[model samples]
Target: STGSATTTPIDSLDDAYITPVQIGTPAQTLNLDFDTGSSDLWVFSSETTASEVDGQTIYTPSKSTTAKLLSGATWSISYGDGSSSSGDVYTDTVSVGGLTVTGQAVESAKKVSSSFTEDSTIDGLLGLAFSTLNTVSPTQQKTFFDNAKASLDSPVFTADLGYHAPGTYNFGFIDTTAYTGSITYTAVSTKQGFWEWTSTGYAVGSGTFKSTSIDGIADTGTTLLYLPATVVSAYWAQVSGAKSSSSVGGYVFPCSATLPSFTFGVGSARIVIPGDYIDFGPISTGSSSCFGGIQSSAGIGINIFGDVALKAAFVVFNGATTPTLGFASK
Candidate 1:
């Protein structure tokens, strides 16, 4: 069987994209951040401390006849910014788009981080990374995609992220109409439990391609595109008045700057990001300086191909015994 879901950027900044998922019987719908960067399907829940949750929908296990406690199971996940969520586990019927999975391990949050609390629009997170990355203790759990693989026509999924627009996620099949041109395929490295792949090279707008193998993760959960310091500086240097700022904690340029598009090569495919996409937004409300969507990945453990990069292409995550990734211009 195949499945599909539509997700919308949560806000003006496109900080995260949110998709609706139904949990338990009678279907309590909640908007969840579909994050491929992690592997824990956790949610705000009745089990959570009320103080930790504000304005977010809570999954009430007591209200669902299908919900069952997974004895001795506990899960915890931490983010780069130190935000965290920890919880006990429950198996319940969960559905996304039209695809349904019974006995799905649903981590019920008992504690939440300040960031999660402040993001009132996000009710929870639906992790799409490998199950090996699941935070469950005693016994790790399979991700929804992993569990759904047997029923899927193909062990694959595709993401079509849009700029300031709604996007689509398809499971088990690729929609040819979704993209233009041929796809460039690359094997994925899953040892680190991420959808990491290497790009052949990169180019600043209208510049020569720098042929180098750049290892990075296609992290749909992340907001900005982060690259090595050299690659970033190479691009930002084209713009006058652009500089890395300790105050902004990233590269920023004049709001009036004529930005240049950035391109990264995947095998032979050239995926280009428009200049406007890199002109992230004003560092402060109505400020003259704007943050660059592309920033240095220095100090970061790994380079990240985040929303800024994904939105420029149609991404396929093939979950075969030997996983691979595909990118096509869209």
Candidate 2:
């Protein structure tokens, strides 16, 4: 089942914002964590003690007055980082920047650990990266999208992530300001929630990785980019004046120096990681901590391209029809 644009509005560029799409709503106003690393929508609950959900967005069911709890279907999920939370099911109308989606299901956690509950600055996660990677089961009663269907113009949704500090994670519409060229389109693989790519190998410092080959997967939900130690060390070696800094944890080099550049061979489509993005923070302290795009994951099986990398590209996850992913940018 290939996803065909139903009512997709072309030319309507909009600012992307994190939003919630609860059960039975029309106006799209919701806050979410547009994570590509994992797929799952979790929020703070009214039942949760204020102390438990310290840094998380705690949405009271009473705020909307229309929200309903799925009393029978409660759940808990654990991440690869070994963190988890438990909560009950609820539905309500969630909207993002005035774009309302009605009758959306959401997980309102009753008990969260210091880690999950600590980040109260950000409201909630609006995981648009991939539906298949969703922590919640597909066969389980329903999904966040299932209820927000009516809000989608066509089957198409855009994540307008920006570099303006906080950035944007808007859905249901695309923003033209992000790029100067036309948007590119590719199909998705619904079997899994990852964006699949046929690599021509890795490239460093503007050079192509001919014999050095590796598989590539895009994950927005993750905060870190994980790669094999061998690959990580190789990338760092390419950086100009690149040297390891013990303070920053990973391979650190001079921030101003742009020596090792990172690019990928995606089915003949070579995508080069932007220089600014390669440097997430201002070179740590005095050593000018220049971060490498690919970091050693010790010996992890998968390579994770976190939010810093995803914002540089336009990613589309097509779970409506053919269960595949499309990567395009201006």
Candidate 3:
């Protein structure tokens, strides 16, 4: 089922958790990271020290003149990158984009770690990945999409993240300009909380490509695209000096070579990976190692297409309308 036609399900972008909700009426916009790893959003409070980066506009209960703490329970979260912050629980009127949700639970972090305390682009995280792993329990639990869906007139949210190009995260509705062509649809697999599916096969450079059925998950939360060992080994077999080197973190292959174009199809929609994606770095071993786009994942779990795969296209997670994965152009 590796190449089987299926939809890309809702995903949690690592660290990119937390949707920033602007306080007060006539709401403004705030950039929030949606993290699936942990559940919690930590925004800088008036209590936050000056040394920390104010990349994101912080919400102070004092400004609202109506904010209230939820028992003042201490909350904290740590990510894989070793960044962490601690704060207290509070209830406030939260607004994402334009949709409004009153009495929403939030984390008011006062003491933040250097990683989080220093970054400028990142103001806070919007935790919508999973509710079970939250740092603090609000008087009333609320999620970015959950609230947006319930409150918005359109009742939907969409993300059109371009690779390294122009990308955007939209709440309440899907933007058409982000897509280049007609949208493709796929059925969702009822597995775990994460989206799971099977791929029919892989096509590299010309040809219809060898039909190899593979099963995995489509995750946007993770940064690196992962694959099974058998598939990775098979993919590298075609590239010169594309051997396993113990030194590399994942796979270390030379950045230059006669790299081939790889195409993956799910029913009618076929996504093509440019040769530049495979023509990887200056590998340590195996002269001119080919940076394998479909590389090993240590163990067989899920095949995640982070930014590399997502950048080339526009994707829609229509979980609310119907369980469907809609793929379009960007």
Candidate 4:
């Protein structure tokens, strides 16, 4: 139908944004995180054990006449943070914004890790990564966007994530009203099933942009920006009284520290992150200590430009034959 939709951020719980989506014949609406890092549409459901699921809404396929069991199909997904979920699969209609896809694979979660079970606000996750990353067994499943792209005017979507503010996710086309300036597009390498691209360089605060090329993924599910160890060290070093704290599990600095703005080079367009955004709130309530929003991507196989970085700019996820990423000032 070439329709489009917009999603807004939920209350600032770690600055995570979620959008409304409907699944099944009668259409049960759910609040789901639009995660670009993973590719699987899973939700809390009747299959989940009662003790495991706390306050999250559960999707009931039994209530939908269009829900069909994908016999012998199963899915299990684990995250870098050790969070995981697994369940059976069903094919049904799923809708987001104004777009709808018939027979979209929807994984019904029978079990979830503490990371998800404890977060009662989020009902599920709508993965926007390459469909190749779908976790269904025997046969991988196509994501909602992948299934609906053929009907879209353009095989693309835009992520307008915000900092403690409402944002939008536009499908099929980019909303010129949402962004200012021309978009600088970069070729993406999707061998890793992510929106991977190389930034020309980055600088701590107002420092000159070094010509160091950094390959990383743009991940919406991730909360913080993760760069190389040396890059993180250099950035934190510029902030007085900042140090890596085992207690905090990241770089922590005095609340009063005059943090510098961080900038990254994207094809010739320089995106700047405000100093306050780097101060990822207080490490602990009632304490004068704060944790940095950017951390080391060491140990992980790839660096991540998470919400902390994405919120600073408007991102376009182009899903043409050769995928590309476009960025612009918001």
Top TM-score prediction, candidate number: 1
Candidate 2 local lDDT, residue 235: 76
Model 4 C-alpha lDDT per residue in residues 185-304, reported as the tens digit of each score: 998998989999999999887788887899999999998899999999999999989999877788999999988989998988899999888887678788889889989998887999
Each model's C-alpha lDDT?
Answer: 0.92, 0.54, 0.57, 0.88
Per-model TM against the reference: 0.98, 0.75, 0.72, 0.97
TM-score of 4: 0.97
Clashes of each: 0, 60, 26, 0
Those runs of model 2 whose alpha carbons end farther than 4 Å from true positions after fitting are: 1-30, 97-99, 129-141, 149-151, 164-187, 209-213, 228-230, 240-249, 282-293
Specify the highest-lDDT model's number: 1
Candidate 4 ranges with C-alpha deviation above 4 Å: 3-6, 10-13
lDDT of 1 by residue, 102-141 (tens): 9999999999988999998899988888999999999999
* Model 3 CA deviation exceeding 4 Å by range: 1-30, 36-39, 46-59, 72-86, 110-119, 130-135, 138-140, 189-191, 210-218, 243-245, 277-295, 299-301
Model with the higher TM-score, candidate 2 or 4? 4
Ten residues in sequence with the least summed lDDT for candidate 2? 6-15
Q: Candidate 2: deviation at residue 156, Å?
A: 2.6
